[PDB]
Design a protein around this ligand. Structure first.
Ligand code: 8Y7
Length: 266
């Protein structure tokens, strides 16, 4: 199982670590941070210029472009590392793809006007992430009769939706979107059953690093969540998750090596 973008490949026979690069000189700090994460073992750098927090004061297209496009550009013309962009906006999708982005990672699964078509036209791999509702309001009262089933259903529908717009099944990644319209129980239900999302035969991407599913369980703030975060990463990778999105790269890469050695021996 592989992915193809910008004339190179990503080999998903083992877990990859995705380093979070939040951009909210700005440009000099970001490149350094991307460098430190590449050295630490990160093979994808995730550039994100719009807060996805439950607060959610949305940003303009011009400001998202200002924050994201120079950073993606800088990274693609130094390093060989794959680059993913956290955007919902078709112009950011178009523009970051031109300057060398490899993966469109949209928390809204290309639901914005023109986003689906803009993604189609780039030919780049697209991540389909589940969220109930939208960021402004998703956390007030998350509710499912059956969270696994509803997330499963969501991937069926979105995979079709992307196929119909001319994006090949081979381009898609799936992500049940931990913390995106989910309480603590919902999140752990999805993590315990994550291996069952393999039936789609698509790479699974997951993102639990320092999230409330650790914070609420341990009753600690965001800087005290590393052990819980590594536990979540290992639990997911043991179930065959292909990409782990994290803040703490060195520690996550160390944990993934232990998982790789374990899965080799099976
Ligand atoms: C942008 N983005 C965030 S932002 C919130 C945070 O970093 O806590 N979380 C995720 C995630 O879980 N999956 C994917 N695919 N993208 C994500």
């Amino acid at each position: 199982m592989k992915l193809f973008a910008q004339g190179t490949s990503l080999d998903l026979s083992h877990p990859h670590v995705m380093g979070i690069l939040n951009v909210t000189n700005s440009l000099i700090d970001a490149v350094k941070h991307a460098n430190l994460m590449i050295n630490a073992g990160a093979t994808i750098i995730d550039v994100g210029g719009e807060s996805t927090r439950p607060g959610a004061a949305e940003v303009s297209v011009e400001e998202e472009l200002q924050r994201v496009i120079p950073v993606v550009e800088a990274i693609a013309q130094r390093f060989e590392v794959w680059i993913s962009v956290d955007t919902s906006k078709p112009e950011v999708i178009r523009e970051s793809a031109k300057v060398g982005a490899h993966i469109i990672n949209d928390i809204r699964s290309l639901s914005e006007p023109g986003a689906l078509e803009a993604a189609a036209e780039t030919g780049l791999p697209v991540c389909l992430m589940h969220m109930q509702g939208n960021p402004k309001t998703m956390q007030e009262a998350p509710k499912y009769d059956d969270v696994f089933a509803e997330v499963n259903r969501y991937f069926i529908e979105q995979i079709a939706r992307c196929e119909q717009a001319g994006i090949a099944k081979e381009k898609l990644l799936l992500d049940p979107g931990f913390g995106f319209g989910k309480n603590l129980s919902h999140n752990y239900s999805l993590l315990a059953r994550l291996a069952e999302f393999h039936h789609f035969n698509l790479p699974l991407l997951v993102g639990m690093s320092r999230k409330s599913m650790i914070g609420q369980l341990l009753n600690v703030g965001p800087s005290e969540r590393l052990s819980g975060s590594l536990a979540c990463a290992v639990i997911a990778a043991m179930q065959g998750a292909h990409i782990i999105r994290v803040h703490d790269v060195k520690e996550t890469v160390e944990a993934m090596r232990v998982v790789e050695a374990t899965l080799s021996a099976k």
